[PDB]
Amino acid sequence: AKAKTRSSRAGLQFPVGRVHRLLRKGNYAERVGAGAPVYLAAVLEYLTAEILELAGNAARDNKKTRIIPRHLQLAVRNDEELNKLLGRVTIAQGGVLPNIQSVLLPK
Amino acid sequence: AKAKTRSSRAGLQFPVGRVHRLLRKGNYAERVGAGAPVYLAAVLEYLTAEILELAGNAARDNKKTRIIPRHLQLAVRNDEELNKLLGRVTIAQGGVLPNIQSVLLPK
Amino acid sequence: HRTTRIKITELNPHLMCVLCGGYFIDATTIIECLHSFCKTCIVRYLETSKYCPICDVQVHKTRPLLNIRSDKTLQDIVYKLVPGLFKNEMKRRRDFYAAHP
Amino acid sequence: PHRYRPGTVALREIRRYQKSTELLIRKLPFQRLVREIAQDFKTDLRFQSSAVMALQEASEAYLVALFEDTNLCAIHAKRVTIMPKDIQLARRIRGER
Amino acid sequence: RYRPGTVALREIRRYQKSTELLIRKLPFQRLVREIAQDFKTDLRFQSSAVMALQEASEAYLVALFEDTNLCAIHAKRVTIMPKDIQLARRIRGER
Amino acid sequence: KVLRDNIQGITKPAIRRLARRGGVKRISGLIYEETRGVLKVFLENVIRDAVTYTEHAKRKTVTAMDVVYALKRQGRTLYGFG
Amino acid sequence: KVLRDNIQGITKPAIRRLARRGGVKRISGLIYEETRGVLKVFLENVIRDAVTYTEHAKRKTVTAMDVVYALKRQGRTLYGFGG
Amino acid sequence: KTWELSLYELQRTPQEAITDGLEIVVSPRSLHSELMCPICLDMLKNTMTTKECLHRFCADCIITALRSGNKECPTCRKKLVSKRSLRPDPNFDALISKIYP
Amino acid sequence: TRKESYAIYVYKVLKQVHPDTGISSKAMSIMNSFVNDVFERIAGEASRLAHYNKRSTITSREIQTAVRLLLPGELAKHAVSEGTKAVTKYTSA
Amino acid sequence: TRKESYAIYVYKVLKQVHPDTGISSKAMSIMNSFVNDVFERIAGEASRLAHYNKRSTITSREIQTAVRLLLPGELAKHAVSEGTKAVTKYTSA
DNA sequence: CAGGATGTATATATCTGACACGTGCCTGGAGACTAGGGAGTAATCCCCTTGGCGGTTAAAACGCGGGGGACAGCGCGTACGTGCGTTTAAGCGGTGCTAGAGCTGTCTACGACCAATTGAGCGGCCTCGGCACCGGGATTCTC
DNA sequence: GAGAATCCCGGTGCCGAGGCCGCTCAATTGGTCGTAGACAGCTCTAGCACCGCTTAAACGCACGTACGCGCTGTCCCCCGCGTTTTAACCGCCAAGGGGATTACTCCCTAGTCTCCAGGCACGTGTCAGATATATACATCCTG
Ligand SMILES: [Zn+2]
Ligand SMILES: [Zn+2]
Ligand SMILES: [Zn+2]
Ligand SMILES: [Zn+2]
C-alpha cells in the first residue's frame, strides 16, 4: 500500500517517526508506547510555534524579515512562562532586555 | 564451585551485585560493563566512610554514642567539599550551624 | 456607519443561554473556553458537573466557581439589543421583593 | 524589676534555636494549610503523616535559608532589621522572582 | 562637555540594544589557553569552543552585574562596589 | 467544607522563631506578611507537583515519595524520607 | 610557551562595557579586580569540566560540544553551538 | 464566597425569548462603548478576551500592546503574562459580523 | 555522515505561522538546541515517572504528566491540549 | 514485600570506622537517601557520557570520569584512587 | 529660555554573502505479521488515615513602657566620570604545515541470557542500654 | 551585687537499636553466542604559527563634581514582659478507604523483513541587510 507518514496521520509537521526512534534509542525506557511519540511531537511543535510567532512579531516590529537570535531572546525574555521554562538557558548573540533602574534615571 | 561474593572479591563492604542489578534495571545504558559496578560501589563506600567518620567525630565532640541527623548535618556543613557536594541537599532534623554575624554582637 | 435595522430571530442564537433557553440575565462566562450562560443557570449546573455544558471542556480541576467571571460587556450588550429586557427584569425583581421583606 | 536591654533576648533565642533542631511551625496549623492548598488541585485528598512531615521540613529549611539571605541583605544595607525589601532582593537574586 | 552620568546612561542604552561580544577575542582566547594549560598540556581549542566559552562568560558576567547593581541600589547607592558582587555571589550560592 | 482562611495558621511567633534560627536579630512588622506570601507560593508549587505525581500514580494519598520527588524536581532534594 | 598574566588582557574598558550592558551607572576601582577574579574562577570551573570531557573522549582538542556539555552540567546551558 | 445566590436568584424564572418576527433598530453609536477596542478605538476584529477581567480587544492591538508596553491589561491594569492569557471569542466575532457586515 | 536536525521542521512551522518571514542559520541552530533540550527534559521526566510507578513503558499519559510538570501554567495547558488533539487524530485513523 | 536498602552496608562501614558508635533510624534513612542520590547522580553522568561519545556501554572509565566531574577536588581524587584499587583487586582476584 | 554642540533615527544607493530553492540518493521510516510479556481488570486483606472526644497545659494574642535603630538632613573631600593625545595591539586577510578529527575494515574479547543453586539479606521478635526528662547545685551572662 | 539562663551531676524509665533466627529469591558459576568496539590505517581539514597593514581601542593624565561616608537628631516601632485565652498536643477510640497483593488474560509493542521516499549534502541565483553618506530631529549643557 501507499506509505503515509505518521506526522501526516496525526496532522503534525514534526517528525513523529524520528521522535519515536530517539525515544527508543535514547535509553529512556525499556519499551515506548505508540501514542508517546505523537504527544511529544505535538508539544514540541506547539512550543516551537509559540517561540517562532513571538520572534517573528519582534522582527516585524524591528522592520526585519529574518528571525535572529536577538529576536529569539526578546521573545523568550518578554514572556514570563517562556522565561521560567528557559531560566537557566543562555541564548548566544541574544543580548539582554532594555532595562534601567529608575534610581539611575536623572533627577 | 564455592561461591564467593563480588564485594568480598573486590574487598568492598558495599553490594557490588546489587549495584550491578541497579545498573541493568536503572535504564542508564543498553549494557553495563563488569568493572563499573565495582568502581561505583567503591566510590559509594568511600563517601559513606568519610561521612560516617565526620559524623562520629561530631558525635564524640558532643559526648553521645549514636549518630543523629544533627550530627550528620554538622559534618556535612563543616566539611567544605561535602557541603559543596550537598549544597542543594536538605537533611531532615539537621538544624543549622551555630553562627552569628559580628555586627550583631556587642563589642 | 448608517442606521441599522435587523431581525431579533437572527440574533437569538448569540444572545440566548443554552441551559435555560432564555436571554442572558446576569451573564457569567467560563474562561477556559469563553462560554456564557445566565448566572443562576451556570452556577446551579456547576454543583453537579465540572465540565462545560457546551464543549465539555473542563472548567476547573476542583472548584469550577474559581474560573467563572461576570460578563458585564455582554450583559449590557443583551440589554441594548433586546427591547424591554432591563425593564422586564427589574419589574419581576420588584414584584418578587414587593411580597418578601 | 529586672529588664533585659533589647537585643540580648533576641541573641539568646538565636543561639537556642540554632543549637536546637526541632520543627518550629505548629503541626496542626501547617497540616491544615497544606490541605487547604491541596484543595485546589484534587478533591478528597489524603496525606500520610510522613508527607506532611516532609513538607514541613522542606518549608522550614527554605524559610531559614531565605531568612539567612534576608539578614545578609539587611546587614549589607547597614541595618539590623530585616525588611520586605530585603526579602524581595534575596528572592530576586536567587531567581525566585 | 557632558555632565557625569549622561554618557554612562547613553552607553547603557547602546550596549543593551546591541548583541555584539564585549570582551576582546584574542585576549579572551589567550586567557582560556592559559587557564587550560593547568589541566592538560598541548591542548587545542576549536574556534566555536572559544566562542561558546566567551558567550557564556559574558552572559554570566552580565547577570552578575545586574545582581550587583540591584545590591548597590538596595544599599542606597548608584556606585557598585566589590562587596556588592560578594553579596550577590553569596546569595546565589557561588561562595 | 471549603477550608478557607488557614494561611494565618503560620503565627508571628513561628515566623520569628524561624528568623531566629536563621540568625536574625530584629524583625520588621511586614516581614510576617511577606513570609506568609512566600511560604504560600512555595507550598503551592511543591504541593502542585506532588499532587501531579499522585494523580499520575492513580492514587488518592499524597505520599512522602511524591513530596520527595517534587522537591527533587524543584532542586530542593530532601533526605530522610526514602 | 606557558602563557602568564593573560587575565590582564581582560581590560577595564571591557569590564565597564559588560557592566553597562548589565545596567550599571557607576563603577568603583576595585570592581575590575573583583570581576577579573570571578571570571577566572568561572572559566577555571567550566574549562576543567570541558577538559575532563575531552579527556574521556580520547581527544586532544576541546570542542564546542564539550563546552556546551560543561555549561549544561553547571546549570549554565548554552544554545547556538549544538546539542 | 461572592457566588452565593440571593433569595431572588434561587427561583428566578427564565426570560422568555422574543420568538415573533419583529426587527430592532440600532444607531451606529448604540454599542460604541461595548464594541470599541480600547487600543485602536475602532470596531473589533479577531476578538481576544483576557481571562482575568473579560475585556475585549482586537488580536493585533493586544499583541503589540503586550509586546511593547507592560504585561498589564490596558483597561483594568490587571497583569497578564502573554497572549495565552487571552482566548478568541467567536461569539463576539459572529455578533460583529451580523450587526455590522 | 548525515547529521540529523529539526531544521526543516522548524522552517515548516515558521512558514505556517509567518509565511513571509525567514530565519538565519544561528536562529536555526538555537531553535534546534531548544527542541533537543525540551525533548530530553520531557523524556527524562517521563522515564523518571515510569521508574517511580514501576512501569516499563513510556505512554502518552507519562508524556502528558511530564509536560504538566515542566511547562508552567498556560504553556502546560495548551501543550496538553495540543497533544490530546494530536493523539486523538492519530488514533482516529 | 521486600524493600531493599543499604542499611546493613552503612552499618558495616560505620562499624569499620567507629567500632563503638551506633546509628539511629533517621540517620540510617538519611544515609540511604544520600547513597541513592549519589548513585543516581554518578549513573546519570555515566549514561550521558556514553550517549555523548556514541557508546552503548558503561565501564569503569565512564564511572571514573563521572566521579571526577561530580565530586570536588580531594573527594574526587580519593574516590578515583579507591575505585582504581577496587578494580585492580577485582581483576587480580 | 535659547543657541550651540552632539547623538541618533530617517531617506537612498551599493554589493555581497548567507539563505531559499532545485536535485541525487540512500538510509531510515513505513506496512505486515508474529509472539510473549507488561499492564488492565477483578477480588481481597488490613494499614493507616480521617474524624472525634477530653484534659492539659505550651504557646499564641493583647497591651504597655521605652530604648534603640531607621530615616532624613548636612557637610566634605576624594574617587570616579569625561575628555583628549598617545600608544598598543586587536582585527583583518592571506599563507603554509600538519596534528589530529573523522571514517572504515577486521576480528577479538567482553557482555547479555539462560539453568541450577545456595547463601546473603530481609521480615519478625526480644531485650537491655542510650538518651529524654526529671530535679538540684554551680557557673556564667546580663544589667 | 541581684537576678535570670544555662551547664554539670545523679536517678529513672522506656523504647527502639542491635542481635538472633527462619526463609527465599536473587547473586554466583558455568557455558554459549552475538556484536561493540579496540586497533590499525587512511584521508583531509581546520587549528596553529607567522607575517604585515590599519585603525579601533586601551592607557595615561588632567580636572571638576557629585556622591559615598561619617555625623547628628529625632521619633516611632519592635522588644521584653506580664496577663489572658485558646487551641495544640497527647492519648485513646472506631470505621472504612484505599494502598498493596495475587491471579487471569489480552493486546500492544519489540522484533524482523521488504520496499520506497524524506531529508540531507550539495550547488546556485538572488535579495536582506551591513555599510556608507547626508540630513533633520531629540537631548543636553551653559550663559
Ligand atoms: Zn440562562
Ligand atoms: Zn465551553
Ligand atoms: Zn483594536
Ligand atoms: Zn482588564
mmCIF file of C-alpha atoms and ligand atoms in Angstrom, chain H residues 50 53 55 73 75-78, ligand 4:
data_model
loop_
_atom_site.group_PDB
_atom_site.id
_atom_site.type_symbol
_atom_site.label_atom_id
_atom_site.label_comp_id
_atom_site.label_asym_id
_atom_site.label_seq_id
_atom_site.Cartn_x
_atom_site.Cartn_y
_atom_site.Cartn_z
ATOM 1 C CA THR H 50 -8.427 38.291 28.758
ATOM 2 C CA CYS H 53 -11.081 40.509 33.556
ATOM 3 C CA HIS H 55 -12.066 42.603 28.445
ATOM 4 C CA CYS H 73 -4.398 44.977 30.978
ATOM 5 C CA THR H 75 -8.301 48.731 30.845
ATOM 6 C CA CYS H 76 -8.121 47.395 34.420
ATOM 7 C CA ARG H 77 -4.301 47.205 34.836
ATOM 8 C CA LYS H 78 -4.511 43.547 35.890
HETATM 9 ZN ZN ZN M 4 -8.794 44.128 32.210
#
